[PDB]
């Protein structure tokens, strides 16, 4: 029958067109209502009477509260570091999605997903990839039914292979910088480290480490060692 | 709804709404000795009716119990309603608590394990309701501390003492911020706009189906200078989005809209063309200044509740931006309800022909500014109030009785003056002067006031009454918290204001009437009461307490009280538009206007003349028109319709449904978004039957004839009274006219209107043989008064007078075959001779019929016409927009009863159930309702609000008749059959004193039939419809049994006061209700008892009364009406003075 | 010739309805109407006395 | 079928309203190719 919802926006103010209605003030002679005349000018009176009041400040100390997410947010990481590469030209065509929504999107598919769920999804506990000491107490013998002959002990460093990197490390130090600083804040970051951090670097190979993931803050990168440095967030 | 679970894992679903009277009894069942530690001597009908809110949490299964009521000061007397600002402030200085800001609690209660959410839930309603409110304040003796369930949401602070003892009180407060944030702000970046825009889609498509999905992310990239975006923030997501554009183009702007108040949106300029040197309704303000307003052009906000307070926050940071600019404009399109950030607008005012696809709105920067207090009258508010009223019509007599308080301490009379300025930046705009009331009583006689306080709670001393109120209208957003600060520092309970009838004197606006400003829109508008006529003379001091008795300048009643002080009492925008008033259509514009949950914006009448009513007659030119009795002047007077109520004068002639537009001639142009037809019937040209006497035919070939429309030009001194406006024109002609002297008039048709035009015409003093009255025979032989006793009484009186009378005969030509204006002689036929007659002037009443004009207009329309206006029983024509009532309207011949129509009944019944269904289109409170099972197309529902005609006629009688809505049938063919009624009957029609009732054999009452020479008390006699003999204290046996002397003396006595009394009716629907409820274990109903005697589902030797009165006086249930009618009797006491219970004694 | 049984039944079906029905709530409005009579008008006539 | 007459009552009939935020509207339009080729031209 009848509804009552639409966009809820203005319109006619727009300086483009006195045009469409020809005359607007065509209805019939008006005998208006009680009410509108008691709003009107002679019940009323006029802005210019009124005092401007001085100060755009004073306003500003009528302010009362803290607003919603100003503090908690705040957070030692630079923004656009975030940003992932893609190669979306910065003038898409009209109707294409324009570039930075595409860099909002996949960062946010990025974090939405959980490194963990998949690769226990692909097989792998994240703690077995690690070399360790042989257990000469008990030396899997091929029945154990492991499914190496035995665990890691080649440093996967070995096989980590570049094929699959979008940046360099000089790049993603580069991508550190956040534009018109000297120096680059540190890039946000996660890694698998043990969980005992001292016996971790005293031992990385020791048997009861477990090795688990983490967010961290990424430091530098030595070419030197192809090694990266990191740590722990507070 | 929110999901609570119990610590027993229970889960209920609850929903907050605001309290209704019922739920007080559970709620107060809730109390417990623990409460009253807290709030102990509260009985909750004091606070709740001193209350600024009410607030009840409920569950879907409807177990009421949660609740709490806050005011604007606080309990245990800590402070003052005088003041408290100062002491909370010496708690912390840096709380920023003030009126402005603030409210306490006094009273909680729920059931434990639900209660604790509960609370929660309604301090998150409190603060989504009231967005200011940053802080809520709770305040106990020392000696307790809160514990859980309030520890878990307030928190402690500095503590006050007693005002008098050594007893101390501790202070604690809950944070908005905590329990509801504010918004952040930040200017738009591309990212935000993934999150809006599935809000946006939700909302509309439309949009996005012009641009394309990514318009939104455009247009954040489109910004610059001229066009900011804009958007609030949570969670670290945005859910609103906000436009700004600086454009607006003037011109628009200076024609449609009266910015006489708004100089401002353009800058000052020293030609200042701001007036003329009707014209200035046709005068537009030459403004030459430059653009300072800017507009919003897109918003959509969102979890949702959070929109509420937030929007306001946005127009903060909007005008940030714009250091230019300091007005901000939007237009709203039609339909589109105030949502919140409008609702802080001013509506603008459109001109006397602006007709713009969209209404407009108003917000200024000032408003952002928050050091807005009320102070009372002191010197140096002279000159800002004399700066402020320059424009104000009465700015003189407000300025003089500002400086007359200031000196006097009172009014020039002495009694209570009190005067009030907002003050703002260390600046004044505002200004409120009121009146304090004492004949409240005299109001509460005339208005149902009632409706929304329970006065007797209240007191004599505690009523305030405005006279003067006037504003800077940005303000006016908060002016309903001014209200609220007015009663509080008044110490006054309601706020009345009284409309006054705008004819007022002939010339003179006499002083009762009042200059209204702005405060309409916040008052409620009153039912008007009825009072019943009282026979003072047989009550000397027994009357009605002579205040209550008197005549007053007879106006309407609009009133604020402060639990009102909050509703946002939420505006509909839709232009809602009804077509005629005659004989019916007021009851719509009234049900419309006595609706306070609503508030009507665009609502237009368009009529011949507009208003009903205007004139100021005397009552012979009410003589000329039969009447139906269910108006006169005062009731137009208190309906006061155009308060609200626009109206255009003249009727409509094109209907066109492509547009949804209406023509008033001329091509002046309305647009309806649901349109409501009732022109009524009215009379039409009394079309000679062309064939003549002088042709000397056989009648049924005239008869033929005379069914067919005249369309030859129209007689000078021929008539057609459909109106007063057209029996004054009417009167004024003649007496400036011979023929009142001398002349010969016919007047013609059979109907009442003819008899009553004749007596009226005796009564301008025209001699009797100088009337010829003239009556042609019937397609039914029903004659217009169905009571042969009394016909014959009025046609002796026209004997006595030398009236001429004609029956059977038809109308040959006026003027024959000359040139028919004027008429000069007449012609008429009969079944046995020709007639002539000489007439001077010719009055018709022949027949009443849609107006032809009216009539082609519908068919243009190519709305369903079969000679009458077709339409289903629930008033839709066949366009579901456009719906249609009253006598003018006819039904499907499917519903096989073609006899039966809208034309049967009252008037006022067929409005208010028009209304009824057309609200439950526009109220949002009840749900939205289906259209109609075809299960009521099977029919047409019985009605029954009795029918009136009432007359005066010739030889000065007075007559009324009431009907149930019947077929016509003959007077003499059902008193002949038996199977109907027993008449009660005392009369002589000639000598003057007459009554008739029938009776039906179910004992009610369904018939009047009174012929008088006294001013009956028709109000009263109206009540008599419908009621049982017992009713009538056992009537029947007082007919039979010589008891009654007559009828108009025996109704005097006081116990059929009650029966007239308007609630009583009301009562009798508790009295039945009580009766339906089920007292005892092993016991039907009365009701159910009856109904078994009467359908012989038992039988008996005794006649079923006997049984039936034997078991009632023995059962207990003649205790508990006996108990209600007493009751009922305390409250009613008040209005009357004859009524026994505890109380009198 | 069927669509008009099919109206004569379905309104003279309603109509004996409507008629039976209102004639059986009318003996109810009666008795109502007595008991709240007889009360009204004692104690009102009571008082004044 | 035999419906032509109605086709001019309804392109009468048809709607007015504008485009609802020009500034949009002019945004667009510049980011139209062929705009900015005519720019070039230009």
């Given at each position: 029958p009848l509804m009552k919802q639409r966009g809820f926006y203005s319109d006619i103010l727009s300086p483009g067109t006195l045009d469409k209605l020809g005359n607007v003030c065509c209805g019939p002679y008006m005998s208006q209502n009680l009410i509108r005349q008691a709003d009107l000018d002679k019940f009323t009176p006029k802005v210019d009477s009124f005092v401007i009041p001085e100060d755009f400040q004073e306003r500003v100390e009528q302010q009362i509260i803290g607003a919603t997410t100003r503090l908690l947010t705040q957070t030692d990481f630079p923004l656009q570091s975030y940003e992932p590469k893609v190669q979306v030209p910065f003038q898409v065509l009209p109707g294409q999605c324009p570039r930075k929504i595409e860099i909002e999107r996949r960062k946010q598919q990025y974090l939405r997903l959980d490194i963990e769920q998949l690769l226990t999804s692909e097989g792998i506990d994240s703690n077995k990839l690690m070399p360790r000491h042989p257990d000469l107490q008990h030396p899997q013998t091929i029945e154990q039914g492991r499914d190496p002959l035995f665990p890691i002990y080649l440093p996967l460093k070995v096989f980590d292979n570049e094929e699959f990197d979008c940046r360099t490390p000089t790049e993603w130090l580069n991508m550190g910088l956040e534009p018109g600083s000297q120096n680059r804040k540190p890039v946000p970051g996660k890694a698998l480290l043990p969980t005992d951090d001292d016996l971790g670097h005293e031992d990385?190979?020791?048997?009861?480490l477990d090795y688990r993931w983490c967010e961290v803050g990424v430091l530098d990168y030595d070419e030197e060692k192809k090694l990266y440095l990191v740590q722990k967030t507070d | 709804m929110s999901i609570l679970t119990s610590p027993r894992g229970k889960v209920e679903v609850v929903h907050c709404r605001r309290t209704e009277s019922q739920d007080i009894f559970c709620i107060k069942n809730l109390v417990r000795k623990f409460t009253q530690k807290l709030f102990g001597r509260l009985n909750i009908i004091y606070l709740l009716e001193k209350a600024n809110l009410a607030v009840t949490v409920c569950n879907d299964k409807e177990e009421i119990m949660a609740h709490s009521i806050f005011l604007d000061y606080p309990n245990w007397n800590v402070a003052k309603q005088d003041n408290w600002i100062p002491l909370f402030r010496e708690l912390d200085k840096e709380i920023p608590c003030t009126p402005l800001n603030t409210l306490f609690m006094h009273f909680f209660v729920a059931v434990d394990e639900y209660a604790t959410g509960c609370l929660k839930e309604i301090i998150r309603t409190v603060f989504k309701a009231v967005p200011e409110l940053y802080f809520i304040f709770l305040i106990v003796p020392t000696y307790l501390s809160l514990g859980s369930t309030l520890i878990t949401v307030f928190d402690q602070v500095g503590n006050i003492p007693c005002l008098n003892y050594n007893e101390d009180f501790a202070v604690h407060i809950c944070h908005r911020h905590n329990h509801y944030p504010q918004l952040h702000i930040r200017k738009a970046r591309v990212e935000d706009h993934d999150d809006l825009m599935p809000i946006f889609m939700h909302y509309d498509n439309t949009l996005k189906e012009i641009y394309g999905e990514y318009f939104l992310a455009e247009l954040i990239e489109a910004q610059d200078k001229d066009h900011h975006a804009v958007v609030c923030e949570v969670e670290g997501k945005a859910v609103g989005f906000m436009s700004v554009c600086t454009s607006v183009n003037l011109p628009l702007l200076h024609e449609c809209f009266d910015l006489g108040p708004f100089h401002g949106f353009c800058t000052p300029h020293p030609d200042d063309i701001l007036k003329p040197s009707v014209e200035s309704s046709h005068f537009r303000p030459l403004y030459l200044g430059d653009p300072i307003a800017f507009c919003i052009q897109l918003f959509c906000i969102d979890v949702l509740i959070s929109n509420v307070s937030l929007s306001l926050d946005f127009m903060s940071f909007v005008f940030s931006l714009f250091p230019g600019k300091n007005f901000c404009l939007i237009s709203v399109p039609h339909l589109t309800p105030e949502f919140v950030?409008?609702?802080?607008f001013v509506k603008v005012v459109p001109f006397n022909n602006c007709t713009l696809d969209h209404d407009l709105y108003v917000f200024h920067?000032?408003?952002?500014?928050?050091?807005?207090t009320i102070r009372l009258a002191k010197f140096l508010d002279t000159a800002g109030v004399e700066k402020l009223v320059s424009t104000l019509l009465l700015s003189t007599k407000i300025l003089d009785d500002l400086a007359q308080y200031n000196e006097a301490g009172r009014d020039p009379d002495g009694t209570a003056l009190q005067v009030f300025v907002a003050e703002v930046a260390d600046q004044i705009v505002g200004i409120a002067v009121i009146r304090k009331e004492m004949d409240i009583e005299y109001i509460r006689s005339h208005y149902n006031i009632e409706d929304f306080i329970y006065?007797?709670?209240?007191?004599?001393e505690e009523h305030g009454r405005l006279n003067h109120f006037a504003l800077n209208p940005i303000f006016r957003h908060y002016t309903k918290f001014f209200l609220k600060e007015i009663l509080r520092l008044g110490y006054k309970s309601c706020l009345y204001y009284p409309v006054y009838p705008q004819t007022r004197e002939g010339k003179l606006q006499s002083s009762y009437s009042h200059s209204l400003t702005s405060a309409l829109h916040y008052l409620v508008p009153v039912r008007p009461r009825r009072q019943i006529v009282y026979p003072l003379e047989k009550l000397g001091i027994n009357a009605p307490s002579k205040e209550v008795s008197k005549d007053q300048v007879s106006f309407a009643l609009n009133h604020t009280n402060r639990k009102l002080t909050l509703e946002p009492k939420v505006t509909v925008n839709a232009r809602i538009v009804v077509v005629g008033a005659s004989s019916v259509g007021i009851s719509f514009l009234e049900t419309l206007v006595f609706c306070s949950h609503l508030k009507f914006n665009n609502l237009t009448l368009i009529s011949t003349h507009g208003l009903p009513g205007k004139r100021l007659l005397h009552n012979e030119q009410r003589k000329f028109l039969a009447s139906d009795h269910c108006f006169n002047d005062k009731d137009y007077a208190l309906m006061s319709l155009c308060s609200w109520v626009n109206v255009v004068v003249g009727r409509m002639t094109a209907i066109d449904r492509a547009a949804k537009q209406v023509v008033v001639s001329k091509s002046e142009i309305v647009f309806y978004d649901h349109l409501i037809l009732c022109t009524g019937l009215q009379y039409q040209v009394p079309c000679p039957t062309g064939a003549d006497t002088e042709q000397h035919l056989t009648n049924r070939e005239v008869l033929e004839l005379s069914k067919q429309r005249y369309t030859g030009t129209v007689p000078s001194n021929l008539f057609i009274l459909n109106d007063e406006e057209d029996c004054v024109r009417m009167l004024c002609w003649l007496r400036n006219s011979s023929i009142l002297t001398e002349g010969k008039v016919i007047v013609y048709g059979n109907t009442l209107d003819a008899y009553t035009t004749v007596e009226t015409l005796l009564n301008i003093g025209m001699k009797g043989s100088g009337i010829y009255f003239v009556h042609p025979p019937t397609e039914s032989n029903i004659t217009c008064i169905n009571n042969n006793d009394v016909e014959s009484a009025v046609e002796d009186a026209l004997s006595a007078a030398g009236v001429t009378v004609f029956h059977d005969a038809l109308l040959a030509q006026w003027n024959h075959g000359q040139h028919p204006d004027p008429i000069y002689n007449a012609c008429f036929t009969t079944s046995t001779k020709p007639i002539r007659l000489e007439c001077s002037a010719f009055f018709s009443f022949y027949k009443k019929n849609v107006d032809y004009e009216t009539f082609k207009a519908f068919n243009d329309a190519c709305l369903v016409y079969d000679g009458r206006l077709v339409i289903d029983t629930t008033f839709h024509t066949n366009d579901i927009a456009i719906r249609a009532a009253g006598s003018l309207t006819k039904f499907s011949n499917r519903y096989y009863s073609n006899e039966w129509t809208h034309s049967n009944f009252s008037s006022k019944e067929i409005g208010f159930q028009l209304a009824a269904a057309m609200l439950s289109l526009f109220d949002p409170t009840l749900e939205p309702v289906t259209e109609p099972p075809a299960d009521l197309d099977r029919l047409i529902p019985m009605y029954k609000g009795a029918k009136i005609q009432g007359g005066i006629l010739p030889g000065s009688y007075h007559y009324l008749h009431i009907s149930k809505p019947a077929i016509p049938t003959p007077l003499n063919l059902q008193r002949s059959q038996p199977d109907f009624g027993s008449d009660v009957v005392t009369g002589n029609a000639k000598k003057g004193t007459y009554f008739r009732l029938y009776i039906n054999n179910y004992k009610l009452v369904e018939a009047i039939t009174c012929f008088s020479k006294e001013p009956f008390p028709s109000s009263n006699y109206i009540r008599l419809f419908g009621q049982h003999e017992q009713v009538l204290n056992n009537l029947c046996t007082r007919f039979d049994d010589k008891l009654i002397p007559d009828l108009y003396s025996y109704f005097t006595e006081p116990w059929c006061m009650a029966l007239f009394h308007d609630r009583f009716i009301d009562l009798k629907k508790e009295l039945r209700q009580i009766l339906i409820s089920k007292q005892e274990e092993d016991k039907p109903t009365m009701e159910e008892i009856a109904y078994r005697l009467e359908e012989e589902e038992i039988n008996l030797n005794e006649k079923p009364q006997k049984y039936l009165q034997r078991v009632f006086e023995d059962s207990i249930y003649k205790s508990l009406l006996e108990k209600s009618i007493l009751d009922y009797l305390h409250y009613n006491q008040y209005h009357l003075p004859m009524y026994a219970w505890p109380g009198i004694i | 010739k069927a669509e008009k049984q099919v109206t004569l039944a379905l309104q003279r079906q309603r109509n004996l309805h409507e008629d039976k029905l209102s004639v059986i709530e009318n003996h109810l409005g009666d008795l109502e109407g007595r008991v709240l009579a007889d009360m009204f008008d004692f104690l009102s006539k009571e008082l004044v006395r | 079928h035999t419906t032509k007459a109605q086709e001019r009552t309804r392109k009468r009939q048809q709607p007015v309203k504008l485009?609802?935020?020009?500034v949009l509207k002019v945004y667009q339009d510049h980011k139209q190719p062929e705009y900015i080729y005519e720019q070039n031209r230009q």
């Open positions: 990385p190979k020791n048997q009861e | 950030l409008i609702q802080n920067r000032a408003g952002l500014l928050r050091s807005i006065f007797s709670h209240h007191q004599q | - | 485009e609802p935020l020009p």
